[PDB]
Amino acid sequence: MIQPQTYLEVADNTGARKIMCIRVLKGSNAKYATVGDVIVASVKEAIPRGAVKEGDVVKAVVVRTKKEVKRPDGSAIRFDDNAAVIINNQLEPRGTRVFGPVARELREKGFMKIVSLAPEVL
């Protein structure tokens, strides 16, 4: 469960290293955001001269979480960090070639782009 003051590892190469959540973009007050959820964030650290700067308020999408996701098939998946990929306002990934796994949830949500670049969809 990602939430407001939470830090996310940056999964693409937008030249951001970390954003902390800021708001989760479910309903008018969702308590948490999970895999496949787009949140507003703040870049807290960012590689020298990337596309994205420290302090840029951005949209991104939770590709990996530390709290296990249940699948209707009765199984579950969990990753050793929380991670998102910064995406466009129209919703396309701002970077290219994202890395580290990803949840199939991403697919069913309309994020094929990222999963295509995803080196391994779990």
Partner 1 sequence: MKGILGVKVGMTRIFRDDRAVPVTVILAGPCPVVQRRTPEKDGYTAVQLGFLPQNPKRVNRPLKGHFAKAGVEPVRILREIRDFNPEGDTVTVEIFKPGERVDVTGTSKGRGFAGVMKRWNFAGGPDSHGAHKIHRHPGSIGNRKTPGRVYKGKKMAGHYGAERVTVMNLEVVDVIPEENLLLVKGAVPGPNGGLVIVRETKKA
Partner 2 sequence: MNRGALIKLVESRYVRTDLPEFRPGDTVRVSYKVKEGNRTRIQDFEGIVIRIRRNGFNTTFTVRKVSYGVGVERIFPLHSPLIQKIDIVQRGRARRAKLYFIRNLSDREIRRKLRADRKRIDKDRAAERAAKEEVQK
List interacting residues with RNA (CB under 7 A): 1-7, 20, 22-23, 25-32, 40, 57, 59, 65-68, 70, 74, 76, 82
Single residue of 75, 89, 90, 110 touching partner 2 by CB under 8 A: 75
On the CB side of 76, how many CA atoms lie within 13 Å of its CA?
A: 8
101: contact with partner 2 by CB under 8 A: yes
CB of 72 to partner 1, least distance (A): 4
Residue linked to tokens 């948490």? 32
Task: Please state the φ and ψ torsions of residue 28, each to the nearest 5 degrees.
Answer: -85, 10
Beta bridge partners of 60: 39, 86
Binding footprint of partner 1 on the chain (CB under 8 A): 72-74
